[PDB]
Amino acid sequence: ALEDLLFDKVTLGYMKGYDECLICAQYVAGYKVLP
């Protein structure tokens, strides 16, 4: 419960980064966040 609470209460999903088209907008000048 505490880990899910921490990940839910902060303002921070793969295989859809390209299909979303920030995360997809960061590739317009090439840099990616590695897993």
Partner 1 sequence: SYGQFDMNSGVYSASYFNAQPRGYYYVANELEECALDVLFKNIAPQIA
Q: Are 24 and 18 in contact (CB under 8 A)?
A: yes
**Cα–Cα distance measured from residue 7 to residue 1, given in angstroms and rounded to the nearest whole number:** 10
21 binds partner 1, rule: CB under 8 A: no
How many of the chain's residues bind partner 1 (CB under 8 A)?
Answer: 4
Q: Which of 16, 21, 26, 27 binds partner 1 (CB under 8 A)?
A: 27
* Least distance in angstroms from the C-beta of 13 to partner 1: 19
32 binds partner 1, rule: CB under 8 A: yes
Distance of CA 35 to the CA centre of its chain: 10
Q: Are 26 and 32 in contact (CB under 8 A)?
A: yes
By CB under 8 A, name the binding residues for partner 1. 27, 30, 32, 34
